[PDB]
Symmetry: C3
Subunit: 97 residues, 3 copies
Amino acid sequence: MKMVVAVIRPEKLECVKKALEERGFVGMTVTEVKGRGEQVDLLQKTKVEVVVSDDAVDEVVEAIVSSARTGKFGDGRIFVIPVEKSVKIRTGDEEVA
Amino acid sequence: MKMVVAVIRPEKLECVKKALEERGFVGMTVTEVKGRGEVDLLQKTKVEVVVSDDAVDEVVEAIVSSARTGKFGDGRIFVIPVEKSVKIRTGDEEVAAAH
Amino acid sequence: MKMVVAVIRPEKLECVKKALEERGFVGMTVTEVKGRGEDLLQKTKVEVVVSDDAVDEVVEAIVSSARTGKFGDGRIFVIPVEKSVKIRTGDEEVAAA
Ligand SMILES: Nc1ncnc2c1ncn2[C@@H]1O[C@H](COP(=O)(O)OP(=O)(O)OP(=O)(O)O)[C@@H](O)[C@H]1O
Ligand SMILES: Nc1ncnc2c1ncn2[C@@H]1O[C@H](COP(=O)(O)OP(=O)(O)OP(=O)(O)O)[C@@H](O)[C@H]1O
Ligand SMILES: Nc1ncnc2c1ncn2[C@@H]1O[C@H](COP(=O)(O)OP(=O)(O)OP(=O)(O)O)[C@@H](O)[C@H]1O
């Protein structure tokens, strides 16, 4: 399992949500953040976290890249982090790699 | 070490906080988030606790029991590896086994 | 690649920002959080994704600029990052082998 962490322009949230939903990726956690790159320096950004299985990573990344890009500086970054265990609170069932 | 990341109902924060504290897990970082899985995005609470490998199951069980309602939307817990843990005050760094 | 996650006192943000910028680490994501250690108080989360060899330099920069010597100075967590993608170009940064 992997956690796909994307930091995008706030106005692109709806595009990213739809591009994900269309491909069958309905689960997500969204956080309001601030940041800067090689560009008051800290500007408003949006963080989208999606936990998926290993094989779905490239599809999720391609969905975010296509829906979040503008071609201008400040489009954002996607970070892929390993997830060793995923637990459903309701049932107590644990998904392990 | 591992980072236990739990996304819970905002009203369950006090239960989770109290449950973790009882078991000796006092250190935690809390973030106000939004999410979906099944208005669109709904208000949720993210609780992050960095613990040693052997304490993971106990931390997960503490969160599961205190955050549960039996209804859909109870939340998820994600376990992430932590390679280095640094205490700012002393500069002391905690590193995982082997090498 | 690694993600350096620092949880600091909110008043130390400008120090940390400057200390990282001086060393060439301009890219960062900041989140307003709450927490406790050894009663949930306002804290600042700073995330910086860097290459493996730059980790120690980044950690030392944060430690020196964020410390006060008093309890509540915070923690730095180092998390592995398998892939880093630039949304604008679609270019992927991975560790060779
Ligand atoms: N190394 C990094 N670590 C953590 N967050 C980062 C990093 N680099 C960028 N970010 C985050 O992604 C957001 C967008 O950064 P972005 O790199 O796209 O800006 P940039 O200066 O215009 O460069 P470019 O589009 O050419 O890569 C930042 O505001 C910040 O929140
Ligand atoms: N795959 C995922 N990646 C990231 N965050 C997720 C994912 N799945 C769920 N979440 C987060 O967890 C919260 C709860 O998700 P969900 O709607 O599936 O309810 P649940 O309690 O996890 O599961 P269930 O519907 O089976 O009871 C969401 O609002 C979202 O913040
Ligand atoms: N184990 C942990 N897991 C997650 N976040 C933590 C953890 N420990 C501390 N934090 C975060 O770092 C912040 C600062 O904690 P800190 O450790 O500096 O306080 P303290 O424990 O009272 O003092 P000290 O570490 O010097 O004994 C907390 O408010 C919380 O947001």
